[PDB]
Amino acid sequence: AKSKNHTAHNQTRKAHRNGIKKPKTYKYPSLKGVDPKFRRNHKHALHGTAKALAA
Amino acid sequence: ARRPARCYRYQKNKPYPKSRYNRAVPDSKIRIYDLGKKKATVDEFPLCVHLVSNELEQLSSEALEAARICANKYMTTVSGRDAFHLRVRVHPFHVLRINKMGMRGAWGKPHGLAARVDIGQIIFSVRTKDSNKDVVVEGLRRARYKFPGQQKIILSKKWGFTNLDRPEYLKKREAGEVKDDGAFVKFLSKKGSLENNIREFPEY
Amino acid sequence: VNVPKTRKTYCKGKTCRKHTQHKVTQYKAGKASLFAQGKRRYDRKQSGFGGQTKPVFHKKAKTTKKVVLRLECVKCKTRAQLTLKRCKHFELGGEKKQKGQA
Amino acid sequence: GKSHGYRSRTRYMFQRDFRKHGAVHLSTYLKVYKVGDIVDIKANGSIQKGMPHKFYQGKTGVVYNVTKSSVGVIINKMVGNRYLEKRLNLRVEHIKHSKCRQEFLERVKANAAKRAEAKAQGVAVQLKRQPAQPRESRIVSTEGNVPQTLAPVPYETFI
RNA sequence: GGUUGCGGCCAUAUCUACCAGAAAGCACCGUUUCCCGUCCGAUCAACUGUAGUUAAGCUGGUAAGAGCCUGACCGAGUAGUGUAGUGGGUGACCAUACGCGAAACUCAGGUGCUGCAAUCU
RNA sequence: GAAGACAUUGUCAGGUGGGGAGUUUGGCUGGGGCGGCACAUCUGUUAAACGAUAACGCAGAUGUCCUAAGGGGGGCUCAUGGAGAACAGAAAUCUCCAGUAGAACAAAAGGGUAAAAGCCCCCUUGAUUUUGAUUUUCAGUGUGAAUACAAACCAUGAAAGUGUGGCCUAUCGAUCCUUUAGUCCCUCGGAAUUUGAGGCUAGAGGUGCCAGAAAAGUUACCACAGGGAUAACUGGCUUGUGGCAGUCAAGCGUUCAUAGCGACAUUGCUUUUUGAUUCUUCGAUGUCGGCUCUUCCUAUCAUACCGAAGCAGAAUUCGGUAA
RNA sequence: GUGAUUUCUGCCCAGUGCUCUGAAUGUCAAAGUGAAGAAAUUCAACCAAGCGCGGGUAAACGGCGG
RNA sequence: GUCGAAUUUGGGUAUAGGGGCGAAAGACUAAUCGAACCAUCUAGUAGCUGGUUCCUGCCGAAGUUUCCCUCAGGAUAGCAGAAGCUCGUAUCAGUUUUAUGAGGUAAAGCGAAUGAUUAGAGGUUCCGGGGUCUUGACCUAUUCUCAAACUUUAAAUAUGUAAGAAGUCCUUGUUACUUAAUUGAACGUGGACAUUUGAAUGAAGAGCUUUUAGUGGGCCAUUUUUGGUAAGCAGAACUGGCGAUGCGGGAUGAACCGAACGUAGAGUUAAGGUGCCGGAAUACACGCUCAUCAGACACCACAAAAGGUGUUAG
Ligand SMILES: [Cl-]
Ligand SMILES: [Cl-]
Ligand SMILES: [Mg+2]
Ligand SMILES: [Mg+2]
Ligand SMILES: [Mg+2]
Ligand SMILES: [Mg+2]
Ligand SMILES: [Mg+2]
Ligand SMILES: [Mg+2]
Ligand SMILES: [Mg+2]
Ligand SMILES: [Mg+2]
Ligand SMILES: [Mg+2]
Ligand SMILES: [Mg+2]
Ligand SMILES: [Mg+2]
Ligand SMILES: [Mg+2]
Ligand SMILES: [Mg+2]
Ligand SMILES: [Mg+2]
Ligand SMILES: [Mg+2]
Ligand SMILES: [Mg+2]
Ligand SMILES: [Mg+2]
Ligand SMILES: [Mg+2]
Ligand SMILES: [Mg+2]
Ligand SMILES: [Mg+2]
Ligand SMILES: [Mg+2]
Ligand SMILES: [Mg+2]
Ligand SMILES: [Mg+2]
Ligand SMILES: [Mg+2]
Ligand SMILES: [Mg+2]
Ligand SMILES: [Mg+2]
Ligand SMILES: [Mg+2]
Ligand SMILES: [Mg+2]
Ligand SMILES: [Zn+2]
């Protein structure tokens, strides 16, 4: 007994019931995948400027 | 053993020509496309008559061969062997398929050849003298019975097989801008080197 | 394929930590001990009545085995393992291909 | 069986332009990309390293990372009923600066100049774009332009 | 404006056949002790600027030139196409309504521009 | 009388053992079976110019091969054609010219490449070590493959640089167990030493039904749960095939296309053939033929009345109204 | 196993079975024996029947082409 | 059929369920036999069939993705309900516009490459073969016709991004990164510019979390489209529907046309209709048609090639 193989019928209508969410944007995006050499120095740069404003 | 032509009348599939993917295809039933005095000069046959298709369909190679024989035989008998130049303007390049014995693995094998014609597309062309208009028209009329669908017979205003109107061709010829090369002619353009355009058409 | 008997490669022997000369041989499995815990458990389960108690593989499909090369450092005798692609013929000897002749 | 390889269905997408094969001109390598720049992706068929997948062809993204011979680009991809963030490592041959804002930065500069210029004279500086408006009234003269009458033509074959 | 070094865009720069080129530059050109490379100092290397030549390279000009580039109410609002009707037609297909809109063809014009440094009637 | 530490009997061990026991004896599928693999994958196309997209659609390919066919550098330029040189010819070797790649690049196909990614030469092992991030299939899991870095150690080149296998798109594998390498570190729980065993990190031994049960048949003596999700009758759609009827008229018919026929082509009709399909029925529509009996259709064998003939008569042939 | 009487029952022992007062240095369990080790243990030699090798057997199963 | 025997038969006795008995049929063993009957294990398991009990109110689906000895079943994501939570002009949108990208289908092209393909003409040979001059070969300029797995060019429809406060500009602090170098990179201090603050329209407000039901056989229509002679056949793409839906219309019909539903009154319409059945003009106007098988309304329940001095217009 052969049956249906594949179809995309009704799939777009299901997607538009609640979906198609535009991605939310955050200030300060995560630094995942950034060059490690840049991240090591930027950590030290942030530490130094903390003391300048604190003092 | 051949199916009726009604089974392959319409253009239901994409073109399926002979190629390195098809390969094993039988030969077309029509091999000669130019009939009569095919060596005649352009100036000899000014009148041109066309058999124009009026439907979007397919014509089998058997039908083209049958219509060619019918048209050539009548014109030769009435007008003469060398009084016209008949040219078939359609070539069968579409391969038909047939499935021979359920529907599992139903992809068919080559069956024959057909020509896919559009609306207003010329099927047959005959050039002859003006005095022979009635004979060639009757010859093309008798060929319609071999074709499915509707065809129209149109008297071309061009000079023979050229793409120019009769007054335009006469004006060029009197100015020495037409040179004969076989059954067709070559024209003179205002471009190119003078060294080449002077040795040709010295009259101009 | 053909692989030279010697190779210069990295050695993490805590004393080299650098490229050294290595001897190349072909890895072999080794005999299975009868006092390994998996073997001891299997023998206990097989005893008594009940017949075969574990699956026995039958539907072999592969025709080749991956070649593993053992590399021993000439300095510190530290060993390392490298796995190559599948091949039907493997040799460690010489007889390099000649560029062109009859 | 079916085939779904990495470069499937890319027969024409990754071809070079006509009479534009060969080496890459040097201006591609002299451009400078910074984090936050907007770039668009178009793969080059002669560079097989750092090549984007065919989905990202013609897409536009924002640079988030800079490396030796490549940059990192962020792409929003719609999967199912929501968009997911995609990060791509592409060599500079496959990207170029997007002009979708180079003509917008000049409008920002123009707005500031016009706002300051009218600050001393007139209120309502009117720095908003407007869509095309309906045409105003006008007078058309017939001096030397007398209307010419046209009629439909009869049917002819001219074949 | 000429020329050389390094370039950018990468034929308006290419290709074919001819003609011209003051000054400088470039080039051909002379030699084989040395470093170096070959069957061969032809290529590559070194030495001299001396012995010679604009013959070629190179640069520019010429051609109802080929190619290429640009434009055109040239073809053509044509082919194709989004949307609509209880429109036509046995059918194949086609017309109309609200929109978008090619290619070939034809003709006209054009034939490298330019950045940094140095130098020259 | 016989027999004797041998038989016998008891416990383990090897062989034999459908006499007997238990169990198994893939899936997809225009019914199932046989065949094939569309079951894990790759190229082009079908695919309707983002991406995605089916059929036992179309044309093919994969379970390999390579110490170089990997990495770096240098020098060089291919297919083919033209004009030449003792033997030498269509094809041997040598020289020049033209040559946008029409060559070559392990393999299928599509991309890509010319002072190279091709050919030749020199030097090499980066096809290395440590652990993360990213792309494709995707649930944003795994596996395979691939991309860009960081921290080491190296190769090559004058140098800038390039190199983490093959110019790019396929070439492959969990848990349990075994085994090897590393760390010589942790544990054997009354306390120690030494063997042995068990853990930690990284590989190998394989599941091709490729997210991975260990598996032969027969039933015409048969059973159960179901299925019209699915085959063997009618009925319905379709009409290739079967049957029947036209159009055109090259020719046949002593002469003469159409009295009677008719090639090459082409348009239909019918459901009295057989296929294709699987919609209805598997808590059942009694299944071949004959016998018996009624009615209906006309595409008319006979009978009634006519037209036509290559219809003298006779006989026959074609056609009309007619069941 | 065949199936009264009459008449006649051909060829094949390679295969599958059955069978042998055949052969010997193939394969081989537990126990036992030897060596090494501090021992657990490992290794080696020896080695029953059967199998393999050899011979017989079709009114045993069966076969009788190009 | 057999009837003097391998005869028929009473009673006694023996053989008991993987057992018996069998002149052999898988026959017989108390109407039970290809493994009897009785009780218990036992309410044995079932991805399979059937059934599953009051009302009203609000919301309201899926037959699709990936994996499975998976294909009449599950897991997983989606669609749905409920509970809410943080806030409230706020950003958003199955839409347009403006600026800027990407594509190789329709069409087109072959005197443009590759691959097919008709016809001559002018040339070429110490380099095909017959003949003392032809036919084949290539060359050059032309000519007819083509391509899902050919292509220079190349749409329409769809498709990525941007249109500001997380913005722009001025000044100058940090670092182990980077630079010949305070050069640059990244992140900051302080200062200047308010909502015609950077297009249009709309916005029963936006954002967010937990948990769980059913479903995982679909089918039809327009358009694009594959296999097949074709099918009320088989298989895809986008959208709208049926399924889950009554109501007016198509006589009749799951899908067509119109329109979607709380209980009533009045008015006006949609699609379709107004001789009678049947509510509504046997209305108006210009023509066409006579058929001894007239014709009469989309989906739709059929007709062709070929003909007529029937009639009408050209
Ligand atoms: Cl569906
Ligand atoms: Cl009993
Ligand atoms: Mg399904
Ligand atoms: Mg077929
Ligand atoms: Mg035991
Ligand atoms: Mg509508
Ligand atoms: Mg005993
Ligand atoms: Mg058994
Ligand atoms: Mg099955
Ligand atoms: Mg696509
Ligand atoms: Mg290589
Ligand atoms: Mg690579
Ligand atoms: Mg699987
Ligand atoms: Mg059914
Ligand atoms: Mg037929
Ligand atoms: Mg079906
Ligand atoms: Mg009945
Ligand atoms: Mg009954
Ligand atoms: Mg006898
Ligand atoms: Mg029996
Ligand atoms: Mg009973
Ligand atoms: Mg119960
Ligand atoms: Mg509701
Ligand atoms: Mg059911
Ligand atoms: Mg395509
Ligand atoms: Mg086309
Ligand atoms: Mg179900
Ligand atoms: Mg239902
Ligand atoms: Mg009706
Ligand atoms: Mg009434
Ligand atoms: Zn070492």
CA C90, CA C4: separation in Å to the nearest integer?
11
CB B122 within 8 A of CB B49: no
Centre of ligand 29 to C-alpha D3, Å, is 51
Flag residues 14-53 of A with CB < 7 Å from strand H: 14-22, 24-27, 37-38, 40-42, 44-49, 52-53
**3-state helix, strand and coil shares in percent for chain C, rounded to the nearest 5:** 10, 30, 60
CA A6, CA C41: separation in Å to the nearest integer?
50
φ, ψ for residue B198, nearest 5 deg:
-90, -45
CA C16, CA D130: separation in Å to the nearest integer?
74
Cα D90 from chain centroid (whole Å): 19
Q: Is B118 exposed, middle or buried (0-12, 13-18, 19+ CB in 10 A)?
A: exposed
CA A22, CA D82: separation in Å to the nearest integer?
7
SS (H, E, C) chain B: CCCCHHHHCCCCCCCCCCCCCCCCCCCCCCCCCEEECCCCCHHHCCEEEEEEECCCEEEEHHHHHHHHHHHHHHHHHHCCCCCEEEEECCCCCEEEEECCCCCCCCCCEEEEEEEEECCCCEEEEEEECHHHHHHHHHHHHHHHHHCCCCEEEEEECECCCCCCEHHHHHHHHHCCCEEEECCEEEECCCCCCHHHHHHCCCCC
Q: Are residues D158 and B157, on separate chains, in Cβ contact within 8 Å? A: yes
Q: Are residues A35 and D64, on separate chains, in Cβ contact within 8 Å? A: no
Q: Is B47 exposed, middle or buried (0-12, 13-18, 19+ CB in 10 A)?
A: buried
Q: Residue A48 in 3-state DSSP?
A: helix
CB B70 within 8 A of CB B86: no
Burial pattern B145-180, b for ≥16 Cβ within 10 A else e, equals ebbeeebebbebebbbbbebebeebeebeeeebbee
B196: nearest nucleotide, CA–C1' criterion: E65
CB D41 within 8 A of CB D73: yes
φ, ψ for residue C86, nearest 5 deg:
-65, 140
CB B76 within 8 A of CB B159: no
CA B47, CA B84: separation in Å to the nearest integer?
10
B142 CA from F249 C1′ (Å): 10
Distance, first Cα to last Cα, chain A: 81
A34 CA from H93 C1′ (Å): 34
Chain H nucleotides close to protein (CB under 7 A) are 61-65, 71-72, 77-80, 92-94, 97-105, 115-122, 141-153, 159-164, 166-168, 173-178, 185-189, 193, 196-200, 207-208, 217-220, 225-231, 233-241, 306
- Resolution (Å) of this entry: 2.2
Collect all residues of chain D within an 8 Å Cβ-Cβ radius of residue A22: 83
Positive/negative CA dihedral, A35, A40, A41, A42: positive
Cα–Cα nearest to B153, from D157, D136, D7, D98:
D157
Residue C58 token pair: 């039958």
For this PDB entry, the determination method is cryo-EM
Centre of ligand 2 to C-alpha D151, Å, is 119
Q: How many CB atoms lie within 10 A of CB D13?
A: 13
Q: DSSP per residue over C34-50, as a string?
A: SSSHHHHHHHHHHSSSS
Distance, first Cα to last Cα, chain B: 62
Write the CB contacts of D129 (distance below 8 Å, at least 6 apart in sequence): none
